[PDB]
Each structure stands twice: as structure tokens, then as C-alpha cells.
Paper text:
In fungi, plants, protozoans, and some metazoans, sRNA production often depends on template-dependent RNA synthesis catalyzed by cell-encoded RNA-dependent RNA polymerases (RdRPs). In the filamentous fungus Neurospora crassa, silencing, or “quelling,” of transgenic arrays relies on [name]-1, PIWI/PAZ protein [name]-2, DNA helicase [name]-3, and several other components, including the ssDNA-binding protein RPA. Interestingly, [name]-1 may trigger quelling by producing long aberrant ssRNA copies (aRNAs) of ssDNA intermediates that frequently arise in tandem-duplicated genomic sequences. [name]-1 can subsequently use its aRNA product as a template to produce dsRNA intermediates.
To this end, we determined [name]-1Tte three-dimensional structure using x-ray crystallography. In each dimer, the two monomers are related by a non-crystallographic dyad. For example, the [name]-1Tte dimer had a pyramidal shape with a pair of double-ψ β-barrel domains (DPBB1 and DPBB2; residues 312–413 and 535–639) located at the base of each subunit. The “head” (residues 457–507 and 822–1006 of the catalytic fragment) and the “neck” domains (residues 428–532 and 784–821) of the two subunits adopted a slightly tilted back-to-back position, and the “slab” domain (residues 1–244) of each subunit protruded from the catalytic domain toward the corresponding head domain. The five domains formed an extensive groove, probably accommodating the template and the nascent RNA product, with the catalytic site located at the bottom. The largest conformational differences between the two monomers occurred closer to the C-terminal end of the polypeptide chain. The homodimer interface is stabilized by a total of 119 and 115 residues of monomer A and B, respectively. However, it showed a striking bias toward generating short RNA products rather than full-length copies.
Numbering used by the authors: 22 to 212, 226 to 249, 263 to 565, 568 to 676, 678 to 812, 817 to 868, 876 to 894, 907 to 922, ...
The structure:
């Protein structure tokens, strides 16, 4: 509708040749991927169809195929998972709760009658299912990441002609792909530098397989889908954009838990009201004890959660355990603030609890920098608070280094430390073992435990090396983000108190178990003040002090925080406009912080009405534009999609006014002047921009700053937006101080104290050397063999020349990193040898990686490139040096060699109880 665009927007999506029409979608999609990966044109027939395809494992279909030689080629692409692809033909797209996705990804192109957008079809991926995909079949949905067409900028034709035919292209008709008609329904914010994207959800309305009609695969429009989900005749009263936003409830990624009976769902008509006006339980309502037992059962938690975040048809938010239920019937209640459209809750998938997230066990959280200036403002003593905060930074940091340098002195304990600092557990479960990247584990802290399990020390330069990398990389996190750890703080779910036990400024926090703070332990909080705060805190009052009081009534509500239902304003609200619908709280009970805090009073949101303008046009006025009947209802849906998209794709000002605030407050060295309450208010209203259909745009933004602020022009980036310190004097600003003056120096200092220390080795005995005589014991033995040789001799010499060329390969390969590491591993694993040439290789062993040659390969590798390329041999052979180092450091009769298989090994962990008691005996 320009036209520039058209013709552009061609041919963005590839077509569908008659040889692929046979079905199914699975191979059709993955074959489309192969063809454009291999840059083969799909409009070359001379091709056919194979029934074996309907059965196999892509590599099977991918080895067809290829043959053909022009499919040689190449190989790849990334390829879908084992459980996924088989389900993509014969498992109907689903494993228990995890659906199979179709996901494409769009980035810009330049010219024309050229595309404009470049497709990237990711392979079939398992994700969790939502309600629509569960209802209509996961095969009928597509999600693409699309660049926003109002993100300036881009290549020039983009927005040279600002407009927006782009959006009209996405919404108006379908998009023909792999035989199907995909029609857009929802558009959301994305869940040197590249550009920002919009996630767009298409629903396949028809295609090559399809058949009518009300009252597989049937024909079925986006208009009927939403009519199912939303139930449209009973919801005309809604503003269409607000009804559009509600789509997000049917798309939310959730685990299905229980379907209730209509009686067992207790739809409350009123919210609990202020003693009085203000709802005191926004989004939160009780579930039964049994549903909570059930939710554990269903998902498999190691314990019943006291609270849950789900979805329940039209309902959304938090359910907590009713403590006053003792009994054995399942029930759940719902409240108005929960229920987001009028749902009759008829069919089963509107009656079923879909679980988003559970109450799980707290971890120490610390203090994000966003809260820093707020705290400084509400500090009693600002200097002492500065000194309070910085001190805690350096001590946790001292604490984690001294703990780690002491551990390193003793294998058992150095192993024990690594295990207490990360987790490959959820990765191990995944791949059935310790996933391995060439010759060594993927995760570094897994790499250490294996090389220590195999009997290595701080005699080995590589082991020293990795110990340093681990802690350094966790330092990096801290020097950028200022995630300043606070031993006495957690992130908790807010819950409200339905039983009237806590008073206006009283909260209840109990743990599900022993909370560790370094010195001391906790299992609840009583008779002590606590700071509560929802991220982000923008007002001085968005951080609130309250008294942590325990009530044994609520003993059973664990790992959450209970706010009162009493007084005028619910606490959740006081914390940056919160409510209880998933929102979590920064709960700090550190005395040194809390007691220097003094409460501020809730501001009044200033009159910003001339800039904030809700488009309240309803879904019923949109139908009335079509004249009556179901038809007028059918097109209204497409009116609304089309119009909601033009809104959805406007620039997210939320993030731009928040940036401006972070700059205007930093310069103005205030969070508590008048221009800060004006922005704080504004960024408040804009978090709801989506679901309120608010009109706030380039015009209003300029208009505002003209009339009420500075200061249109680029306000400066703050100093802490760099690495090293910019200006004149040791820093004044709290955040600059904390970054440049404290964190940087504290870290660099302690990084060095154990790079001192490496590095001291020379031959004092002590210290670290890549060289280890044990690790070349296969090499030397075979080198005098081979003296004395004949053609053995031929064996060794070509191995050594081979290895050379492989390390040469590493040199370049200095284009994805593990890929490179693998590419050149297989070239490493390719080095292959009357008489012992029958033995060493041992091809009754299925895979070259548990043979004796492999040792010799690696022990020889080591001597030649330990100089030199220590790394190169560890990333290829590391597990083969492990055999060696395990065999040789063993004497025999003082322990034999116990070989644990990958699964059994990934099933074992270091035994803290044993390490504590076994040192207790070594230090007699």
C-alpha cells in the first residue's frame, strides 16, 4: 500500500513443489531447511517421494538424499532432537506436556524487487505447550521473530517511507508456507549490536489436507479460534485492544495440572476490599490442600508448594494454600481481579489448572543497583550506608576467594568446593550422563571434578588454570551488573493473608528449610524489621520497611512472604504498583541495611492526562460497524487484529522513558525532586501500556518534555555505562563509586593475589606445570619399539605428522566454537593405524574413542604439544589423559582402578559428610 513494498514482500516464504505435497509437515519443513541451507532451488523437480521417510531419524532421511552429490553438501543444519522429530511424524507433535514447535526467525535484507526480510527456519524444537496448541493441535501454529518496523533504524528503504504497509502485510491475508495458510493473531514484545524484535504468532487456517465445517485436518479460521478461547458474544463490552491482550493467556507456556468440576471452582463475585475501597487481594485466591498435593504429584516436585502461579481459563494469577481447609475435597476459588474475560468455563480446557511456576526454595539474592539510589535517599546516614554497602561487597568476595584458595590445597576439598559453586545436574539428566565437548566436559566446573576424580592436583597447570577461569568469570558478572550480594536477602512470592492474623505493617516469612547465612542459620523471621521491595523501585516509597512477625497459624505457608489484608492500601500496591499475580519481592533482613532505612510516604500520581489517552473503542462498536449476526462478529476479529497490530508495533516508549529517567536522575543526583515523580509516574502508567491500549507516542513524549521537563536532547550516558573511569576526581555518584572505586579494585586485587601464585613455580615443589612424566608413559614405551622398528616407525611417524596437521587446523579455528572444537576432534579422532595393528585399534570396540591406540595417540600428543599447545590436547584428549593419569598414579595393592560408566558417574556426587569426616582424621 505504498508502493515500494510492493513489489517487495514477494516471495519471502519459499513455495511448495508437488513432490512434497504427499505430507507430513515434519519432513516437508526439515527438507525445506536442508534445501536453502544447501542453497538448492526447490523449483527443480527431477524428484519424487520415499515411504521409508515416514518412519526413521532425520540422519536416515538426511542420508537419502544426498546421495545426489550436489547435496554433498555440507552437512547440517543444526538438526532437531531425538524425542522431537519422531514425535513430529508419529507422536502427533507432543510428549506429555512439551509440544513441538515450528519457529522461524526474521532479520532484514537490502534490495529489491528483492525480499526485504531474510528467513531463518530453526529446526523443530521442544517447548512447553500452551492452551491453544493443546486444543487445536500444535502443528497448526507458527511463531516468528520479526524486527519492529518502527525501530529506527535499518537499511534506508526501511522507514525512509515510514509506513507500515509492513504490518498490513502481516495481518491482512495469510502467508502460504509448506502447504498451509498462516494468519496472524498476536504480537508481543521479545521475551555491533543487532536490532529489536516482535514475536508474531500465526495460526494455520487451511492448506493441503483440509476440509469443512462447524459443527486430521479441518478448516478453521482465526476468527473461530479466538471465539473458542475468548468466547466473543459475551465479551463485546471490552475494549478490543484489551481483549486482544488477553490472548496472552492462551499462549502462556504452562504445565497442565488438574481439571476441576464446575462445583469445585468457586467464582467469588467480590474482591476483598479495603477496610475500604481498595482491593486488598489483587490476583490472589486460595486453592485446597489437596490440589496443592496434586500439583506436586503431577509435576514432580520434591514437596507440596504452598503457593502457585497458574492460569485457569479466564482466570490468571496466584493461588495459595488455604490454611483453614483441613479437608479431602479439591476446590479452588477465583476472584474478579483474577478473571480477565467472561468465560462460562464450559469445556474441559477452560476448567483445567495450567501451572506457570511454583513456590520453590529460596536462594540469597542480594541487591540490584536499580535499588541503590532509592536506598541512599531513604538512608538515615548516607555516608555510613555507602560504607555499609561497599563493605558487604568486598567481604562476600573475600569470603569466596579465601574459601577457594584454602580448598585448592587439598584434592578432596578442592573437589568439594567446585560442587558447592555450580550445577550441571539439570544438564546431566538431559543427556543421560556428563555431556562431553570433544575430550572434556562442557561445563568447566564439571571438567575439574573429572580431572580431580581421575587423580589430578595443583601440580597440573591446566587444573590451576580452570580454577582461575571459574571464579574470574563470576567476578565478571559482578563488575558489570553490580549484583551486590546480600547474605540476608531473598526473592519471594508475595501472598496476602486471607485469615486476618497480621496487622497493617506486619509480614510473615517462614522457610521450607535451614537458611544459611555464611556464621548463622534461619527457618523464619520474627521480632525484626525487614525491607520489602519490588523490582524496579523508582519512587523513594517503592522500598518499604515493615516488621517481620511470625504467626504459627500460617506455619504451612513456606518459602513465600505473607502481606496483610488490613489497613487501607495493600502492601503489594505500595511496592511500585504491585499486586499478587506472580510478582515477587526483594526481602532484605540485613540489620546494617534495614535500620539505616527510613520510610517515605506514598506520592500522588501527578496529572498526566493530557499525554495519556486510552483508546477505549470496544469490540461491540467494532462489530456494529459491520451492521447483526455471527458474520459481523467474524470480521470484527480481523478488524481488531489488524488495528491491534498497528498499535502493538509502535515504539516501546516504556524502555525509553525509563532510560531517560536513569539519566535525568543520575545528573540531577536525585530520585526525590519533582521531575523524578513525573517520570516515575510515567513509567508506571507505561508498564500497563499493552493491556490498557494507551496512546502515548512520539508527539506526546516531546510535548511532555517541552512543557514539563528539560530537555528533549540526548541527556548524557552515565559514567557507570563504561568500564574504566571517565572524569575528574574519585567518583561522587553512589553507583560510580560502587563500580569504579570499590568493585573494580576489590576484584582486580583478589584476582591477582592468586595470580602470584602460578607463576611462583619455577622448582620449589610447588607448583604448576603442564608437564607430567606420567602422561607421556605410553609415548616413550612405544618409542623404543620402534628402535628396533621395521614399519612401526610407519605407525608412530604418521600419527605424529597427523597430529601436527590437526593442531595446525586448530591454529585457524583460533565459526561457532564448540562446532570448531568438534569439527577438529573428529579430524583428531580420524588418526587411524600383521600385527599389533590388529590389537591397538581393537575394532570389536564400536567407537574409536575406548581403545588403547587412543591413549598412545593422546600421550604422544601431550609430549609434542604440552610445550606449546597444552590446551589443544586437553580439549581433544583430556578424558584419555584421565585414564593415563589414573593408571599411573596408581600403588597397586593400595587401591585398584574403579571404572564408572557415563550414566552411573553422572549419577554420583561428592560426599560432603565424608569429606568433613575424612579431613577430620587426616588432621588427626
Amino acid at each position: 500500500q505504498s508502493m515500494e513494498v510492493y513489489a517487495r514482500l514477494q516471495n519471502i516464504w519459499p513455495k511448495f513443489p508437488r513432490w512434497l505435497h504427499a505430507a507430513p509437515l515434519a519432513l516437508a519443513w526439515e527438507l525445506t531447511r536442508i534445501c536453502l541451507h544447501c542453497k538448492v532451488d526447490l523449483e527443480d523437480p527431477t524428484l519424487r517421494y520415499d515411504p521409508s521417510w515416514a518412519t526413521s531419524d532425520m540422519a536416515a532421511l538426511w542420508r537419502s538424499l544426498t546421495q545426489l552429490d550436489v547435496f554433498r553438501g555440507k552437512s547440517f543444519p543444526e538438526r532437531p532432537s531425538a524425542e522431537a522429530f519422531a514425535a513430529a511424524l508419529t507422536g502427533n507433535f507432543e510428549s506429555r506436556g512439551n509440544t513441538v514447535v515450528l519457529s522461524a526467525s526474521l532479520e532484514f535484507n537490502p534490495s529489491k524487487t528483492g525480499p526485504l526480510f531474510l528467513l531463518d527456519m530453526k529446526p523443530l524444537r521442544f517447548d512447553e505447550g500452551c492452551r491453544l496448541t493443546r486444543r487445536f493441535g500444535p502443528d497448526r501454529f507458527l511463531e516468528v521473530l520479526v524486527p519492529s518496523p518502527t525501530a529506527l533504524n535499518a537499511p534506508s528503504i526501511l522507514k525512509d517511507g515510514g509506513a507500515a504497509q509492513v504490518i498490513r502485510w502481516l495481518t491482512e491475508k495469510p502467508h502460504s508456507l509448506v502447504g498451509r495458510q498462516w494468519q496472524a493473531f498476536y504480537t508481543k514484545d521479545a521475551g555491533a549490536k543487532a536490532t529489536f524484535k516482535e514475536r508474531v504468532h500465526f495460526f494455520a487456517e487451511r492448506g493441503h489436507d483440509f476440509r469443512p465445517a462447524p459443527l486430521r485436518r479441518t478448516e478453521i479460521r482465526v476468527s473461530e479460534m479466538l471465539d473458542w478461547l475468548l468466547q466473543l458474544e459475551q465479551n463485546e463490552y471490552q475494549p478490543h485492544l484489551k481483549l486482544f491482550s488477553r490472548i496472552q493467556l492462551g499462549l502462556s507456556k504452562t504445565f497442565p495440572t488438574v481439571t476441576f468440576e464446575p462445583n469445585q471452582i468457586r467464582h467469588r463475585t467480590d474482591d476483598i476490599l479495603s477496610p475500604a475501597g481498595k482491593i486488598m487481594n489483587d490476583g490472589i485466591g486460595r486453592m485446597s490442600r489437596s490440589v496443592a498435593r496434586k500439583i506436586r504429584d503431577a509435576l514432580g516436585l520434591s514437596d507440596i508448594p504452598s503457593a502457585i502461579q497458574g492460569r485457569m481459563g479466564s482466570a490468571k494469577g496466584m493461588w495459595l494454600m488455604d490454611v483453614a481447609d483441613a479437608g479431602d475435597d479439591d476446590w479452588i476459588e477465583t476472584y474478579p481481579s483474577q478473571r480477565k474475560w467472561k468465560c462460562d468455563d464450559a469445556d474441559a480446557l477452560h476448567r483445567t489448572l495450567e501451572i506457570r511456576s511454583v513456590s520453590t526454595e529460596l536462594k540469597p539474592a542480594a541487591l540490584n543497583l536499580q535499588f541503590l539510589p532509592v536506598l541512599e535517599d531513604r538512608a538515615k546516614d548516607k555516608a555510613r550506608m555507602r560504607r555499609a554497602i561497599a563493605a558487604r561487597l568486598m567481604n562476600d568476595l573475600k569470603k569466596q576467594f579465601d574459601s577457594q584458595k584454602a580448598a585448592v590445597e587439598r584434592p578432596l576439598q578442592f573437589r568439594q568446593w567446585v560442587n558447592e559453586c555450580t550445577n550441571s545436574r539439570s544438564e546431566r539428566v538431559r543427556h543421560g550422563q556428563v555431556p562431553f565437548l570433544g575430550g572434556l566436559p562442557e561445563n568447566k566446573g564439571e571438567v575439574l571434578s573429572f580431572l580431580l576424580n581421575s587423580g589430578f592436583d595443583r601440580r597440573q597447570k591446566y587444573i590451576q588454570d580452570l580454577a582461575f577461569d571459574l571464579q574470574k568469570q563470576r567476578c565478571e558478572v559482578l563488575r558489570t551488573k553490580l549484583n551486590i550480594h546480600v547474605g540476608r536477602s531473598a526473592y519471594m512470592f508475595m501472598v496476602v493473608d486471607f485469615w486476618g492474623v497480621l496487622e497493617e505493617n506486619e509480614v510473615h516469612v517462614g522457610f521450607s528449610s535451614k537458611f544459611r547465612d555464611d556464621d548463622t542459620t534461619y527457618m523464619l523471621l520474627t521480632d525484626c524489621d525487614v525491607l520489602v521491595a519490588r523490582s524496579p523501585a523508582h519512587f523513594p516509597s517503592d522500598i518499604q520497611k515493615v516488621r517481620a512477625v511470625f504467626k504459627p497459624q500460617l506455619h504451612a505457608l513456606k518459602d513465600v512472604i505473607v502481606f496483610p489484608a488490613k489497613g487501607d492500601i495493600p502492601l503489594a500496591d505500595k511496592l511500585s504498583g504491585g499486586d499478587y499475580d506472580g510478582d515477587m519481592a526483594w526481602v532484605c533482613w540485613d540489620p546494617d541495611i534495614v535500620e539505616n532505612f527510613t520510610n517515605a510516604d506514598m506520592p500522588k500520581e501527578p496529572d498526566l492526562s493530557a499525554y495519556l489517552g486510552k483508546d477505549k473503542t470496544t469490540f461491540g462498536e467494532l462489530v456494529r460497524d459491520t451492521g447483526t449476526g455471527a458474520a459481523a462478529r467474524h470480521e470484527a476479529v480481523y478488524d481488531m487484529i489488524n488495528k491491534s497490530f498497528q498499535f502493538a508495533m509502535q515504539p516501546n516508549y516504556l524502555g525509553i522513558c525509563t532510560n531517560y529517567k536513569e539519566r535525568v536522575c543520575y545528573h540531577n543526583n536525585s530520585v526525590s525532586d519533582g521531575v523524578a515523580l513525573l517520570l516515575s509516574t510515567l513509567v508506571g502508567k507505561l508498564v500497563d501500556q499493552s493491556k490498557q491500549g494507551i496512546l502515548f507516542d512520539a508527539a506526546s513524549w516531546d510535548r511532555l518534555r517541552r512543557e514539563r521537563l528539560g530537555g528533549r536532547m540526548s541527556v548524557e550516558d552515565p559514567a557507570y555505562k563504561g568500564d574504566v573511569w571517565a572524569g575528574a576526581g574519585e567518583p561522587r555518584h553512589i553507583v560510580d563509586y560502587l563500580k569504579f572505586a570499590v568493585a573494580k579494585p576489590t576484584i582486580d586485587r583478589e584476582l591477582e593475589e592468586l595470580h602470584k601464585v602460578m607463576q611462583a613455580s619455577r622448582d620449589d615443589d610447588a607448583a604448576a606445570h603442564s608437564w607430567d612424566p606420567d602422561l607421556a608413559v605410553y609415548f616413550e614405551n612405544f618409542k623404543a619399539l620402534t628402535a628396533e622398528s621395521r614399519s612401526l616407525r610407519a605407525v608412530l611417524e604418521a600419527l605424529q605428522n597427523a597430529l601436527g596437521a590437526v593442531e595446525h587446523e586448530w591454529k585457524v579455528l583460533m565459526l561457532t566454537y564448540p562446532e570448531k572444537v568438534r569439527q577438529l576432534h573428529a579430524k583428531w579422532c580420524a588418526i587411524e593405524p600383521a600385527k599389533t595393528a590388529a590389537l591397538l585399534e581393537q575394532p570389536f570396540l564400536a567407537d574409536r574413542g575406548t581403545s588403547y591406540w587412543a591413549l598412545l595417540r593422546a600421550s604422544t600428543a601431550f609430549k609434542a604439544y604440552y610445550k606449546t599447545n597444552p590446551k589443544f590436547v586437553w580439549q581433544m584428549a583430556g578424558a584419555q589423559l584421565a585414564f593415563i593419569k589414573a593408571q599411573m598414579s596408581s600403588g597397586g595393592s593400595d587401591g585398584m582402578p574403579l571404572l564408572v560408566t557415563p550414566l552411573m558417574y553422572a549419577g554420583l556426587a561428592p560426599d560432603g559428610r565424608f569429606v568433613k569426616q575424612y579431613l577430620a582424621r587426616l588432621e588427626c
